[PDB]
Amino acid sequence: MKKIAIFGSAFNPPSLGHKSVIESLSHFDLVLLEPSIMLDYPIRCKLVDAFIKDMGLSNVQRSDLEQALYSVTTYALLEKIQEIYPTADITFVIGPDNFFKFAKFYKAEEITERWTVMACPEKVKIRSTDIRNALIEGKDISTYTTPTVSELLLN
Amino acid sequence: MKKIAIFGSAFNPPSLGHKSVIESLSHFDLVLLEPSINMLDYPIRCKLVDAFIKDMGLSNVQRSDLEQALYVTTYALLEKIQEIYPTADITFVIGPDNFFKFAKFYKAEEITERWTVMACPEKVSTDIRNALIEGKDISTYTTPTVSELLLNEGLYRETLSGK
Ligand SMILES: [Cl-]
Numbered sequence: 001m002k003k004i005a006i007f008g009s010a011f012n013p014p015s016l017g018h019k020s021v022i023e024s025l026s027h028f029d030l031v032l033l034e035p036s037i038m039l040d041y042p043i044r045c046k047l048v049d050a051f052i053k054d055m056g057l058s059n060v061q062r063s064d065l066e067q068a069l070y071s072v073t074t075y076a077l078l079e080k081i082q083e084i085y086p087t088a089d090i091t092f093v094i095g096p097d098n099f100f101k102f103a104k105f106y107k108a109e110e111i112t113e114r115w116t117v118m119a120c121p122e123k124v125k126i127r128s129t130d131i132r133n134a135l136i137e138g139k140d141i142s143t144y145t146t147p148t149v150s151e152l153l154l155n
Numbered sequence: 156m157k158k159i160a161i162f163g164s165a166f167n168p169p170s171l172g173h174k175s176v177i178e179s180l181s182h183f184d185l186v187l188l189e190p191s192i193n194m195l196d197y198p199i200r201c202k203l204v205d206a207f208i209k210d211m212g213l214s215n216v217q218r219s220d221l222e223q224a225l226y227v228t229t230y231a232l233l234e235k236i237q238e239i240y241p242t243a244d245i246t247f248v249i250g251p252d253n254f255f256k257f258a259k260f261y262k263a264e265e266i267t268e269r270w271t272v273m274a275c276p277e278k279v280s281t282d283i284r285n286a287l288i289e290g291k292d293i294s295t296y297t298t299p300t301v302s303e304l305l306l307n308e309g310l311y312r313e314t315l316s317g318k
């Protein structure tokens with residue numbers, strides 16, 4: 001791996017919103033989906049695994065760096081992935097909202113000395129709260145996420 | 156081709172700081188350097204950028220002059236680039252200083268709706284301009300052919316337009 005992108009999110013649940021970001025990253029050697037430590041962590045991990053299967057994109061894997069680090073800061077996460085892959089160049093994938101407020105992040109300056117920070121457009125716009133509310137309300141969520149994820153959510 | 160990164164800068168003059176950003180973009184199919192419009196005249200900056208590209212020896216980098224053609228906000232520039240390469244995915248590249256000032260860009264939010272924005276780390280131009288005016292060594296600030304052109308034409312120290 002030379003170019004590694006790491007995309008942290010609640011993935012609560014993974015949605016077509018996340019997919020619209022992740023599918024833009026085909027030029028990276030490895031794209032790591034790191035679920036943050038309401039759906040509990042083990043279920044979110046299973047949902048992310050289903051999501052990855054559904055997307056069928058060769059460069060995407062789930063990462064669990066927060067598990068050994070466990071609050072877990074972006075800095076700590078990037079430091080850890082850099083230690084695992086010393087020869088790689090690391091890119092942190094962020095939402096635009098956080099991109100605009102990055103100066104407030106713990107060790108923001110230090111991050112910008114070491115690593116790339118990338119905001120990808122959210123071409124599909126879906127709030128997690130809206131999906132989880134749809135589940136409670138009993139409405140169809142098949143167009144909100146990928147098929148295996150939706151099957152797992154209903155169960 | 157499919158992944159195109161655009162890096163705008165004054166390139167006034169191109170430095171090892173610019174190189175540190177551009178060399179991180181090997182994963183893009185094409186990287187376009189767009190010089191913007193103590194400011195050296197645009198055609199001279201273009202000449203420096205051409206030498207800089209040759210010096211870096213990175214096969215995916217080209218100079219682009221679409222700003223000259225539009226004579227220009229980032230928003231307008233990206234719209235034009237998307238027009239020229241309609242099937243490409245475009246990423247706009249900035250360094251840390253513009254990164255923390257990005258909200259101030261014209262239609263910054265609309266940019267993020269349409270295109271990827273990437274802030275690359277500075278691992279390594281105003282220091283060069285200062286060293287040239289004072290006769291100090293610049294060989295550690297820029298690439299060899301750029302240094303040659305800066306000195307030979309008396310850029311900054313004696314002229315800004317070469318006229
Ligand atoms: Cl989420």
Ligand SMILES: [Cl-]
Nearest residue numbers: 165166167280
């Ligand atoms: Cl500059």
